[PDB]
Each structure stands twice: as structure tokens, then as C-alpha cells.
Design a protein around this ligand. Structure first.
Ligand SMILES: [Mg+2]
Ligand SMILES: [Mg+2]
Ligand SMILES: [Mg+2]
Ligand SMILES: [Mg+2]
Ligand SMILES: [Mg+2]
Ligand SMILES: [Mg+2]
Ligand SMILES: [Mg+2]
Ligand SMILES: [Mg+2]
Ligand SMILES: [Mg+2]
Ligand SMILES: [Mg+2]
Ligand SMILES: [Mg+2]
Ligand SMILES: [Mg+2]
Ligand SMILES: [Mg+2]
Ligand SMILES: [Zn+2]
Ligand SMILES: [Zn+2]
Lengths: 85, 169, 176, 63, 222, 97, 38, 162, 43
RNA sequence: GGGUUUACGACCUCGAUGUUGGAUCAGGACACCCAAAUGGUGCAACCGCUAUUAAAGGUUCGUUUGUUCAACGAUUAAAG
């Protein structure tokens, strides 16, 4: 009762060549990496680091109010830490 | 012979008690109680970014698309709600939900004041381009307790029977 | 009876807890459920976990709905690290690429949740990025020639020293 | 466990394992049974250590 | 429906090192060998020092007078250090270590014979003084809720206040004392020596204005 | 809806609410309809049939509840409160069910 | 029942009622939360 | 006024709502500028437990109080009117505002003790056995403390405790 | 039952005798008289 | 909050308030031992633990010690 044993057989090379976790069935057939000539631009046009801030978003879009609601939830949770019930 | 500072409240002299009772505080009581007095002038409220975005979104909805159907949002399970979402996206007709506090004033200001009695309870706005009510009626027939209240198909407000006639047309 | 969520391996579905007593209290058999699960996941690589939903009816009958394998498992496999990092954000566990993230999104989109939700692959890619940053794995744009091994040797030294320090701290706590 | 019968492994001190046959079956309606064997030693807890020290003192007379 | 209000964000508040409370000694490093007299002027009257905030934002304000010893110090220290957040909150003392000695005698000793023996040390605290001052990137409701316990367990009546609360209560006090209706006030009577009431009053009443009586402080007396 | 969820609505056959959305007294009617069509009422019993009749010139909202005790509860709710309708229906199905 | 000077709810199901000239914290889920103001 | 009518016709219950005519407000109020009903009819500090014609305007036929959101009174006068209604009910006024029970009206009990200006409930007060001395006296409360701001034509304060 | 310990107006626990409206009015009248006196003694 | 032990002060008596324990007689308080009505329990029942209300009635017989206390024997519904 553990995870799959097959993990990074040739770590310096196979991981760079392609992904091995894509094959779920017992029939081993790993997919090719499909270099950048195949994947569209939205894959690279997204943030791959730390998220943005409420002081950086503009108060005319929807994600700004999403983050504001999330911060209000966090504030209410911090205030509700003295629940005696 | 007690100390100057004690714990038993150090019961005072009778003259000191009289002096305290005389020098007690008296709050200012006006002639007319200002509570039920005619209220002060209105402190008018300002519009916020959220209500501005809601107004802009409702305007864009009512200007761009053609089929704007109004239905009663039935309290169903989230799995069934997402299944209905998928069955509507198959036909490429979306759903939206707007708060009454922002939808009633916009509708009573615009030309759609004939929809006021429809937005009393829960509401759901089915938005579609190139209206095709046949598939909508078919997909709402599969659910018994989800009735179509009404809506507008190209600036033509119709009831459930009107929608049925438009679908059979 | 209702819905039960479970996460069991592909072919390692044993009739003991923490799966036995649940279906035992519900009413359905455990050996029968294990046989059904094994015969339904016999083609799956034994060792990987995948979520399943068991719908038990009042007549002690059960139906099974299996989803795509665990995204944590997908990320750990794509990174080549067995067990994720402890101090997320403070240490680096593995190294994946946007290509691998898009591949995981493509192979996991065919599930119940992302089938009911008509979302594009961008949403799934963002969810995979979030899960990877939660695991502590960094996601570089496009860097995989030898940097994977250059970071792997340092990560191996780091985990070896971490295990040594853990054993030392355990011995110290036992002696104190 | 196998089926409707879980087998629980645990490490319980012998000094506290007394009078367990009258409690296990009493809380399991008599359907439970247990088997044990001497396994290892470990440093005793402070409360029991002080208790057995006081016992030895009262046995030897002087505190 | 409800409009989303923004959350208060704190970034200029720098949490210093060692945010928790420090340890205080029951007896200082240089114990007073010469026994002193128990002056009550250190309790009678309003507090003159440590009446404003220095770096913190919340505080435990004492509306009365009394003594604080090692037991109360340990109680406050343990409670605050176990119920505070060392990552977002810091605390600081506003009262020094106990230095005033207190003399005691054993039971069975008749009156007189000389002074007793130094038993313990206490810290004199006047009315209107802050005891513990805390700061950080936290709100006011949680710190108030978790400091009301210490304020209750303190000997004198105490309240968990902040800059805003102290300013508000002082403004309310000034408003009341300036819009009071009766023309006769304790301060006016004591200063003019009306009715010969100086025979009953005390020379410190001329300054206390009938607000401080012994160790008790009633803020509702103008 | 929690009342009808915890009251055990397994003992009902058909519940139909006939109304006209273009009237001026349909608030309580639609509130009752949603309270009886909530997900909890559905999961309480699956053999029941919930029907919502929508008209345009009926001008008389009504609720018909047929349950297997041979009972037909008809409530012509045009001025009654939704809570009053709900509590009356609950009391009746609890007394006869 | 516990006779106290200051009553306070211990769970979200305790309700405070004014009866017999006193306050009573009654709980139906956990009967051990029954409090009575003295 | 709305009334719920129930009809039983062969295992079929018919519940219907019937709206009747209700009397409206008098045309000429003495002070139309006031927002609150009593504060605009200039009955503030004027009503008492004796004034039944004023208290009987807003009470359910079973002696119940009417909600503030439907009445429209200010909070202080609403509490005062609730106190006055309780005191009148205890004193024995409003005889036609009790629930009709033909099964319970037959077994007559001990005669109702004549009372008025009562503050607490008749079944929730314990008799004073110590009664205190002159300096520490257990005063017996009479009347509600909320009505201490009534106009006093005699000028003397109302004895709320005796 | 209620015993006043010690003497009635000397000990630590004295008599709780309150102040009355008569005494309040008397003190207010005396204060008004003294205010008039201290005004006449100004110029 | 009470004034039940010790101590604290010496206010009333040293031209007298006669001092511990037992016998008889008990009065009163409840901060209730039993008997009565209840709540909660890590209350399964017998045994238990605490809380509320309730003072009309009871609260044993013996060895030792002058003993109040104290240990022990036998009981009671209990030996406040
Ligand atoms: Mg003196
Ligand atoms: Mg305190
Ligand atoms: Mg005295
Ligand atoms: Mg005396
Ligand atoms: Mg005595
Ligand atoms: Mg003394
Ligand atoms: Mg004498
Ligand atoms: Mg003598
Ligand atoms: Mg003589
Ligand atoms: Mg007796
Ligand atoms: Mg008692
Ligand atoms: Mg008993
Ligand atoms: Mg007795
Ligand atoms: Zn509770
Ligand atoms: Zn008013």
C-alpha cells in the first residue's frame, strides 16, 4: 500500500525528454513532449509565480472584487477566533 | 481612625455625601426628543465600483444578446446545477444571476418595466445569441419543478405559452 | 445510504480499514466491493491512487464512479520526487515545466468535475499550477536540459542532511 | 482487519494491562478478544516511577 | 446583497524581535535592606506617568488604584504569551519590576515591638495608568476579547482599550464636564470654600475635584 | 425548507403549484414553491411528483397536494403568507400521515 | 442544572429564556449545559 | 385584516385567505410633523395603565402584542406600551381579550385577587420574609420604571418602590 | 436580625443613611446664598 | 458573605460575669446525614459523585483516655 515505484528512471534525461506520469494503463506508452511549435500562447501568457495583490488590481474588474471577498473572509475568520461556542 | 486609602470604600461623611449628591452630573435634555422628530436631510449615498460594474454588465447583457429569458432559480443540488450548466453550454446558451437591488432600478429605468412582477423571488437570466427556444424548452421539460417564467425574444416579451408558441413556430 | 468518497490504489484495494468499517456500517459487502474495484482497475498501473465515489442505495446496492488519478501523484511523478517538500515555499521539492503542466491538464480534463464544468484548458492549467505551488514544486517556463539534474543532486544532498538531522533530533529528544 | 472484524495492534504497558479482560468484552458486548506478549522495555513514566518509589519506601519502612 | 468593504492592511508595523513578554523577578537583584514606610500617595490620585501610548496600539487601562505583585505578573505573562500571536503581535510592559517592600508579622505577635520582616515586593499603580501595551498587525476585537480576561483578573478594575477608545472616552468626559447642567460643581465649591466644606474635604480634593476617593475612581462624577 | 426536510415528506404523492408569474400576489406562492422544491425535500423522497403550472390569465394561485392517505389538501393561497402556508401544510401532513 | 452568577452559552444550541424570575440557559443537544442564574 | 378560513369537506381541507375592512387613521392629527404615532398625536408622557382606549388600538384579540415593524412606534414608547399592556392584563382590564375555552371556563377557581399597578408576574415573586430594617429596607416595587417621565400635575415624583 | 456592628456612626461599617431631597434643596439654597454673597463681595 | 478555632484591642464587670468535660432539658439557624421532589453524569441496573427546593421528626449501643477530639466492635435510613 504505497505509491507507484516507477519514478524518474533516468532522471537527468528521461524527465527532460518527456513526462512519464501520463501513462496510467499498464500498457506503457509515454507521450512525446510536443515542443513549443504545438502548444498555444495562452500556456505561456499566464502567471507562473506569486499571485497579484489587491493594491495592484484595478477596482473595475471582477478578480479585484474576488480577492476583496477572499480578504474579507480571512478578516472575519481572524475575528471569529474567540468563539466560546 | 482609618487610613486615607482603604478597601472598604471608606464610607464618607454626611456632608460629603450631600456634596456629592448636589454635584452629581445632570445630562442635557432637549425639549423635543430628536428621535421621532422629523429626520435631518438625506445623506445621499455614493455609487460604488461593484454597483457600477453590475450596471455596466446588465447594460451589456441587454444590449448585445437577443434571447433574455427569465426563470425562477430553483434551489437544486450543485451537481445537478453543473449538469444543467453543461447541457446549456452544449447549445451555447449561458445563465446569469443578478441581485434584485441592482436589477429592479435598472429595469424600471429602462424600457423593460413590464418585467417587474417577475423578479420578486429567485431569478435566473438565460442569455442566448441567435435564439433557439426549442432546445431550451426540451431541456427544461426534463426537470418538472423548473418552470419558465417569461422573457424577451428580440424585444418581444412573452410568457410561458408565448415561449412555447415561439418554439413551435 | 448516500455518497462516500475514497482514494484507493489501482489494484491494492484490501478489505480492511480505513475502507472496511465504512462499507460495513453502510451495509454492503467489503470483499465484493474489492473484487469490483480490482476487476474495474485491472488495466491500471498497480500503485497509483485515484478518487472514487460510492453511491449506496437503501437496498444495500452500490455503484462506483472512478475519476482521474490524484493530481498530487501526477505532479510528484512529473517532478520525479516520491514525497513532497515539508516547508513549502522555504525549500524546493522538484522542477516541472509548462509543457508538463499542459500535459497533466490534458490527461486530467476527462473527469467528472471538469466534464460538468465547461471550462477551457487554461483553468485546469491554473489549478495544476496552484497544486504544484502547494506541493512546493517550482514551475519554470522552459528550462530542461541538465538543470533538472543540477538541482536534483543538491536536493538529494539536502534531503540526506535533513534525514540525518531528523535522526539526530529524535535521538536528542529520546535522551533528554 | 478482514471483514466486520478489525485487528488492532498496539503497545500497552503491562502495569496498565491488568483488568483489561473485564473491560474489553464489557465495552464490546463480549464479542472482543485480545492476545498479547512481552515485547520490549522503555523508560517509565514519572507518575508511575514516583508511585513505585513510594511503594518501595513504604515496603522498606523508612521514607 | 451587501457591499464589499475593504480590509485594514498593515505593512508599516514592524514586529520587533522577542514579541512575547519577558520574565520579571519577585525580588530585584539588589533587595532593599532598609525597610520603608507604606506611603499611600503612590496609589491615591490620578496617574502622572505612563498615561499615553508609546509604540503599541492597545493597552490594559486601570480605572483604579492598587498593588501588583509577582503572582499577578506571572498570571498576565503566562496568559498573554499563550494567547498572543508572536508572528503578528507583540507586547510590552508599562510598569516596572516590583520594588516596594511590604512588611509582615507572624501570628501570635502582639502589637508593637518594632517593624516586621520584608515578605514580598509590589508595584504601585494609580488610576488612569496603562499596564500592558501591545501592537502589531491585528484588529481590535480579538485583542480586546483576549485581554478582557486579564483586565478582569487584575485587582483594580481594568479595561482593554486602544488609542481610539481612549480618545473617545476622554472626549466624552470633556463633553459631559462642559455641558453639565447644574451650576454647582465640586471643583467650584472646593476652590471657593463654599459652606465651609473644606472642614470635611481633604487638601487633595482641591485637585481630585471629587473624582478620586481613596483608591477608587468613578469617571461618572464630572 | 428545513421543516419539510426534517418532517419526513416520504408520505406524499403529488404536489402541484398553479400560478401566473405576471400577477401582484405571487411572492408567497413562489416562496412556497421553492421551499417545497428545495434539494432537501427531493432527497427526502424520490417517489413524489412536484409540478409547477405556469399560466398568464389564471389570476388565482393555488396549491394541490394529493397524498396516499386518500387526502387532497387544496390551498388557494392568494393573500396568505408563505410561512403560514408552509406551517399549515406541515401541520396537516403531520396530523394525517 | 448548574447554578451560576454569570450565564453563558457553551454551544450554538443553548437558548436563554426568562422563567420564574430568573434566567435559564437551556440546551437540548447537550443536557449538561443547563445553567440557572442565581 | 386578514383571516384564515378552513373548510373540511370529505377528507379535503380548503384553506383560504379573506381580507376584511379595517378602520383608518383619524383625518386631523394634532401634530402631523411627528414621525412616531404617539409622538405625533402628542400622547407622549400622557398614557397610563388606566387608558384602555389607547392601548386597545394595537393588540391581538388574544391579548398578544403587535410587532413594532408593523405598528410604527419608536422603541421607547413601544416598550412603555408593552409594559402598560402587561400591567392592564394583570390588573384585570381588557376582559374581551382572552382566549375562549368552554372546557376550562367551567371549573371555576379561587376568586381573582383585585390588583393594579403591578410590576412583576403573579406567579414568579417570592414573599419577603426578612423585610429589612429602616436603613436596609426591602422596598416593594409598584409600577413600571419606564413611565417615570410622565407629566406630574402634582409635581411630586412617582413612588416606583413602596 | 440586622445588627449594626459597633456604634451607629463611628465604626468601619456605619449606617447606610442616605441623602434626601430636603437636604439637597437646603444645600442648593445655601449655595445660592453664598454665590450671591461672593458676588456682592467682588466690587 | 459568616463570625465556628487561634490571635489581635482591653470597651462592660477583679466592694466576684464561679472555670472543662458528662446526667436531664432542649430552643434556634441550614452551610441537609436520613427520610421527600427533582437536573446533570465518563448514570447500563445495585452501589456511586455533585447541584436545586425543602428543618414538622430523628440522628445508637460499648472498650480506653477526665477528656471535646481520637482508634476500634456491632448495627441502623442515618450516627450532620
Ligand atoms: Mg484619623
Ligand atoms: Mg479585576
Ligand atoms: Mg459601629
Ligand atoms: Mg453596637
Ligand atoms: Mg461568639
Ligand atoms: Mg483583629
Ligand atoms: Mg458595665
Ligand atoms: Mg473580676
Ligand atoms: Mg454588686
Ligand atoms: Mg432542638
Ligand atoms: Mg437551603
Ligand atoms: Mg434523601
Ligand atoms: Mg431538626
Ligand atoms: Zn448547549
Ligand atoms: Zn415615537
Amino acid at each position: 500500500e504505497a505509491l507507484k515505484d516507477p519514478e524518474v528512471c533516468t532522471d537527468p534525461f528521461r524527465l527532460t525528454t518527456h513526462a512519464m506520469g501520463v501513462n496510467i494503463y499498464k500498457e506503457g506508452q509515454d507521450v512525446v513532449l510536443k515542443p513549443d511549435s504545438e502548444y498555444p500562447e495562452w500556456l505561456f501568457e499566464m502567471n507562473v509565480g506569486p499571485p497579484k495583490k489587491l493594491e495592484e488590481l484595478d477596482p473595475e474588474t471582477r478578480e479585484y472584487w474576488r480577492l476583496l471577498r477572499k480578504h474579507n473572509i480571512w478578516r472575519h475568520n481572524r475575528l471569529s477566533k474567540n468563539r466560546k461556542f | 481612625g482609618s487610613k486615607a486609602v482603604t478597601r472598604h470604600r471608606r464610607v464618607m461623611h454626611f456632608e460629603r455625601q450631600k456634596l456629592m449628591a448636589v454635584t452629581e452630573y445632570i445630562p442635557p435634555k432637549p425639549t423635543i426628543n430628536p428621535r421621532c422628530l422629523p429626520p435631518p436631510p438625506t445623506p445621499p449615498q455614493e455609487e460604488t465600483g461593484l454597483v457600477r460594474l453590475l450596471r455596466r454588465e446588465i447594460a451589456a447583457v441587454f444590449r448585445d444578446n437577443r434571447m433574455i429569458a427569465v426563470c425562477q432559480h430553483v434551489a437544486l443540488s450543485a451537481e445537478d446545477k453543473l449538469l444543467l450548466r453543461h447541457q446549456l453550454r452544449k447549445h451555447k446558451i449561458l445563465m446569469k444571476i443578478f441581485p434584485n437591488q441592482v436589477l429592479k432600478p435598472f429595469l424600471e429605468e429602462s424600457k423593460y418595466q413590464n418585467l417587474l412582477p417577475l423578479f420578486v423571488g429567485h431569478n435566473l437570466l438565460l442569455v442566448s445569441e441567435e435564439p433557439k427556444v426549442k432546445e431550451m424548452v426540451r431541456i427544461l421539460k426534463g426537470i418538472p419543478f423548473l418552470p419558465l417564467l417569461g422573457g424577451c425574444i428580440d424585444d418581444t416579451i412573452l410568457s410561458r405559452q408565448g415561449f412555447i408558441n415561439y418554439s413551435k413556430l | 445510504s448516500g455518497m462516500i468518497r475514497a482514494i484507493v490504489r489501482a489494484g491494492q484495494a484490501r478489505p480492511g480499514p480505513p475502507l472496511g468499517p465504512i462499507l460495513g456500517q453502510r451495509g454492503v459487502s467489503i470483499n465484493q466491493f474489492c473484487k469490483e474495484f480490482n476487476e474495474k482497475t485491472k488495466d491500471i498501473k498497480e500503485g497509483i491512487p485515484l478518487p472514487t465515489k460510492i453511491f449506496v442505495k437503501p437496498d444495500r446496492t452500490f455503484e462506483i464512479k472512478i475519476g482521474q488519478p490524484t493530481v498530487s501523484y501526477f505532479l510528484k511523478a512529473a517532478a520525479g520526487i516520491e514525497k513532497g517538500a515539508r516547508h513549502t515555499g522555504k525549500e524546493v521539492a522538484g522542477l516541472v515545466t509548462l509543457k508538463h503542466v499542459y500535459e497533466i491538464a490534458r490527461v486530467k480534463a476527462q473527469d467528472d468535475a471538469f466534464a460538468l464544468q465547461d471550462v477551457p484548458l487554461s483553468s485546469v492549467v491554473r489549478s495544476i499550477i496552484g497544486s504544484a505551488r502547494s506541493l512546493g514544486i517550482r514551475v519554470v517556463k522552459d528550462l530542461s536540459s541538465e538543470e533538472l539534474a543540477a538541482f536534483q543532486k543538491e536536493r538529494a544532498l539536502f534531503l540526506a542532511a535533513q534525514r540525518e538531522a531528523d535522526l539526530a533530533a529524535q535521538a536528542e529528544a529520546a535522551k533528554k | 482487519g478482514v471483514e466486520d472484524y478489525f485487528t488492532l495492534y498496539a503497545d500497552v504497558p503491562l502495569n496498565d494491562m491488568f483488568g483489561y479482560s473485564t473491560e474489553l468484552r464489557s465495552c464490546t458486548e463480549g464479542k472482543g478478544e485480545y492476545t498479547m506478549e512481552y515485547s520490549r522495555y522503555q523508560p517509565c513514566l514519572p507518575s508511575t516511577q514516583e508511585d513505585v518509589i513510594n511503594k518501595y519506601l513504604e515496603a522498606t519502612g523508612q521514607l | 446583497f451587501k457591499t464589499l468593504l475593504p480590509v485594514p492592511t498593515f505593512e508599516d508595523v514592524a514586529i520587533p524581535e522577542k514579541p512575547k513578554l519577558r520574565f520579571v523577578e519577585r525580588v530585584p537583584l539588589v533587595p532593599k535592606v532598609r525597610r520603608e514606610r507604606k506611603n499611600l500617595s503612590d496609589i491615591r490620585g490620578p496617574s502622572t506617568e505612563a498615561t499615553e501610548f508609546t509604540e503599541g496600539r492597545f493597552a490594559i487601562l486601570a480605572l483604579g488604584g492598587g498593588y501588583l505583585h509577582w503572582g499577578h505578573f506571572e498570571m498576565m505573562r503566562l496568559t498573554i504569551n499563550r494567547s498572543m500571536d508572536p508572528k503578528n503581535m507583540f507586547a510590552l510592559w508599562r510598569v516596572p519590576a516590583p520594588f516596594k517592600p511590604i512588611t509582615r508579622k507572624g501570628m501570635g505577635q502582639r502589637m508593637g515591638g518594632g517593624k516586621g520582616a520584608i515578605d514580598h515586593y509590589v508595584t504601585p499603580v494609580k488610576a488612569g495608568r496603562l499596564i500592558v501595551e501591545m501592537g502589531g498587525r491585528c484588529e481590535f476585537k480579538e485583542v480586546q476579547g483576549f485581554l478582557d480576561l486579564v483586565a478582569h483578573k487584575l485587582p483594580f478594575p481594568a479595561k482593554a482599550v486602544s488609542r481610539e477608545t481612549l480618545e473617545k472616552m476622554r472626549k466624552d468626559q470633556e463633553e459631559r464636564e462642559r455641558n453639565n447642567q447644574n451650576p454647582w460643581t465640586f471643583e467650584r465649591i472646593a476652590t471657593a470654600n463654599m459652606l465651609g466644606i473644606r472642614k470635611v474635604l481633604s487638601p487633595y480634593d482641591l485637585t481630585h475635584k471629587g473624582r478620586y476617593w481613596g483608591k477608587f475612581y468613578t469617571p461618572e462624577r464630572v | 425548507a428545513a421543516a419539510l426536510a426534517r418532517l419526513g415528506l416520504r408520505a406524499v404523492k403529488q404536489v402541484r403549484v398553479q400560478f401566473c408569474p405576471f400577477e401582484k400576489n405571487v411572492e408567497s406562492t413562489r416562496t412556497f414553491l421553492q421551499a417545497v422544491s428545495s434539494e432537501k425535500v427531493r432527497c427526502t423522497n424520490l417517489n413524489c411528483s412536484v409540478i409547477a403550472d405556469v399560466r398568464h390569465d389564471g389570476s388565482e394561485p393555488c396549491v394541490d397536494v394529493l397524498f396516499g392517505d386518500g387526502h387532497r389538501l387544496i390551498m388557494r393561497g392568494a393573500h396568505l403568507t408563505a410561512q403560514e402556508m408552509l406551517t399549515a401544510f406541515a401541520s396537516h401532513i403531520q396530523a394525517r400521515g | 442544572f448548574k447554578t451560576k452568577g454569570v450565564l453563558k452559552k457553551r454551544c450554538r444550541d443553548c437558548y436563554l429564556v426568562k422563567r420564574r424570575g430568573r434566567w435559564f440557559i437551556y440546551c437540548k443537544t447537550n443536557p449538561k449545559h443547563k445553567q440557572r442564574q442565581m | 385584516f386578514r383571516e384564515v378560513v378552513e373548510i373540511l369537506d370529505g377528507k379535503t381541507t380548503i384553506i383560504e385567505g379573506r381580507i376584511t375592512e379595517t378602520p383608518q387613521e383619524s383625518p386631523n392629527p394634532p401634530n402631523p410633523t411627528g414621525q412616531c404615532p404617539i409622538c405625533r398625536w402628542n400622547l407622549k408622557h400622557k398614557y397610563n395603565y388606566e387608558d384602555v382606549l389607547l392601548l386597545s388600538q394595537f393588540i391581538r384579540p388574544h391579548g398578544g402584542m403587535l410587532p413594532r415593524r408593523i405598528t410604527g412606534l419608536c422603541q421607547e414608547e413601544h416598550l412603555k406600551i408593552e409594559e402598560c399592556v402587561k400591567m392592564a392584563h394583570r390588573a384585570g382590564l381588557l376582559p374581551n381579550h382572552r382566549p375562549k375555552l368552554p372546557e376550562g371556563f367551567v371549573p371555576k377557581s379561587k376568586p381573582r385577587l383585585n390588583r393594579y399597578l403591578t410590576r412583576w408576574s403573579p406567579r414568579s415573586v417570592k414573599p419577603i420574609y426578612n423585610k429589612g430594617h429602616r436603613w436596609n429596607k426591602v422596598r416593594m416595587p409598584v409600577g413600571s420604571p419606564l413611565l417615570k417621565d410622565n407629566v406630574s400635575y402634582s409635581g411630586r415624583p412617582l413612588l416606583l418602590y413602596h | 436580625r440586622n445588627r449594626i456592628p459597633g456604634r451607629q456612626w463611628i465604626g468601619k461599617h456605619r449606617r447606610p443613611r442616605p441623602v434626601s431631597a430636603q437636604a439637597k434643596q437646603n444645600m442648593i439654597r445655601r449655595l445660592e446664598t453664598e454665590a450671591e454673597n461672593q458676588y456682592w463681595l467682588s466690587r
